[PDB]
Specification:
- It contains 4 helices and 37 strands.
- By secondary structure, it is mostly beta strands.
- The protein is globular and about 60 Å long.
- 5% of the residues lie in helices and 47% in strands.
- The structure holds copper (II) ion (3 copies).
- One copper (II) ion binds next to loops.
- Cu(2+) 4 binds at residue 280.
- Cu(2+) 5 binds at residues 370, 422, 427.
- Cu(2+) 3 binds at residues 114, 375, 421.
- It holds the Pfam family Cu-oxidase.
Length: 439
């Protein structure tokens, strides 16, 4: 096939994407070895769904797993009666998700399980796929003439031909794997045919961070999790926390081979040491550097000029309330808290009003990085750690290093009961999640 593996694409037809997926234990070849993964559509990653604003999506999920499951439509500002974090599809049963893609929406989204207590083993085992919302902005020449690729960043560990089981330490840190894969391939080669590449990036890992850097090149950020920036932003590196997405333009500068790497990054994962009657937690330190892919530039590359403008960010109404959500940790218990409480599906933690804007101050009082995710209601990051954000764009995951406060501007959209949680999904399963009700 093509030198660069990407998930098969399913496109809406006539304004309708009607599709049946099964979540099933699937024998596969992955990274040169045979393993049984849990997949949607028989593949890892699952198929990429590609849709347009105002399309109807009709996705029937058939659960062929031995445990209940469901879907989270991560990043989609749709009803929590559709993107239902409390729904359980029992083994052998099916459920049809039907929604209309919102009109003012563009970017890279994804789908994965969100059954409390079950998310980390199910996601680690292979249950995820991308959803792309096309934009009329994709027709401007500076994007249309770029070479587009999707990069699903997701790691894996295998034991006896199956995903490695979670250990106690995995529930504390979030599980990372030794196979650091792009679209399920081990260090694929991307032989570019155009000088400008448009890369859609998805961190679909349970816990691994990707400190992205391309050798000898900057990246031009053009979209965050949930939409375009107002204009391209040049960056020397780009950190993608679990659950985050970005879109970047790469302008290949000369012929040659260039490594896309995940540089060393310390997210505060912990180990255990015994140095003479000790048995105390100790930092793992930064991750070892990983090569993600080999990028081969074409001959005499002449990149396109960057687009001058992308999408204006909406002027939001003045906010009517300020929230505070403090994250804390009990590491040795592998328990994780929001304002001192663990998740309770029967308990409503916040009550807000549809079509108002809230300021959420999320404070990480732990020592690990925690990537904070809100369902249903995309937000504008105003600042993190007291540093203003350098762009305006919709996000739905914001990473907090130890001690950092993030200030979010949160327009409340669809009415109903939804959730917010750490997207180190082991921490969510272990309690770091709360309930928002919008009325
Ligand atoms: Cu998610
Ligand atoms: Cu979630
Ligand atoms: Cu966390």
């Amino acid at each position: 096939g093509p030198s660069f593996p990407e998930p098969k694409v399913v496109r809406s037809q006539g304004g309708l994407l009607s599709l049946k997926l099964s979540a099933t234990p699937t024998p596969l070849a992955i990274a040169g070895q045979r393993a049984t993964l849990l997949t949607y559509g028989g593949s890892f990653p699952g198929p990429t769904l590609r849709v347009r604003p105002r399309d109807t999506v009709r996705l029937t999920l058939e659960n062929r797993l031995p445990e209940p499951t469901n879907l989270h439509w991560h990043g989609l500002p749709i009803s929590p009666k559709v993107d239902d974090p409390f729904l359980e599809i029992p083994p052998g049963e099916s459920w049809t998700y039907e929604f209309t893609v919102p009109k003012e929406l563009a970017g890279t989204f994804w789908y994965h399980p969100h059954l409390h207590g079950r998310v980390a083993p199910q996601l680690f085992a292979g249950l995820l796929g991308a959803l792309v919302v096309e934009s009329s902005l994709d027709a401007i020449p500076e994007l249309r003439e770029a070479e587009e690729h999707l990069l699903v960043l997701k790691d894996l560990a295998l034991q006896g031909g199956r995903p490695a089981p979670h250990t106690p330490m995995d529930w504390m840190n979030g599980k990372e794997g030794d196979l650091v894969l792009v679209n399920g391939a081990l260090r694929p080669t991307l032989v570019a045919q155009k000088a400008t590449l448009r890369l859609r990036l998805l961190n679909a890992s349970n816990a691994r961070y990707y400190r992205l850097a391309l050798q000898d090149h900057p990246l031009y950020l053009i979209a965050a999790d949930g939409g375009f920036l107002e204009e391209p932003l040049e960056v020397s590196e780009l950190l993608l926390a679990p659950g985050e997405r970005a879109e970047v333009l790469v302008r290949l500068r000369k012929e040659g081979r260039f490594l896309l790497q995940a540089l060393p990054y310390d997210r505060g994962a912990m180990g255990m040491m015994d140095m003479g009657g000790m048995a105390h937690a100790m930092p793992q330190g930064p991750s070892r550097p990983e090569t993600l892919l080999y990028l081969i530039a074409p001959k005499n590359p002449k990149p396109l000029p960057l687009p001058k403008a992308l999408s204006p960010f909406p002027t939001l109404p003045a906010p009517v309330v300020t929230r505070r959500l403090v994250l804390t940790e009990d590491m040795m218990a592998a328990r994780f808290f929001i304002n001192g409480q663990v998740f309770d599906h029967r308990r409503v933690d916040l009550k807000g009003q549809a079509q108002t804007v809230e300021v959420w101050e999320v404070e990480n009082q732990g020592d690990m990085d925690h990537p904070f995710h809100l369902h249903v209601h995309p937000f504008q990051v105003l600042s993190v750690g007291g540093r203003p954000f350098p762009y305006r764009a919709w996000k739905d995951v914001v990473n907090l290093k130890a001690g950092e406060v993030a200030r979010l501007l949160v327009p409340l959209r669809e009415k109903g009961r939804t959730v917010f949680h750490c997207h180190i999904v082991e921490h969510e399963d272990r309690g770091m999640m709360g309930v928002l009700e919008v009325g």
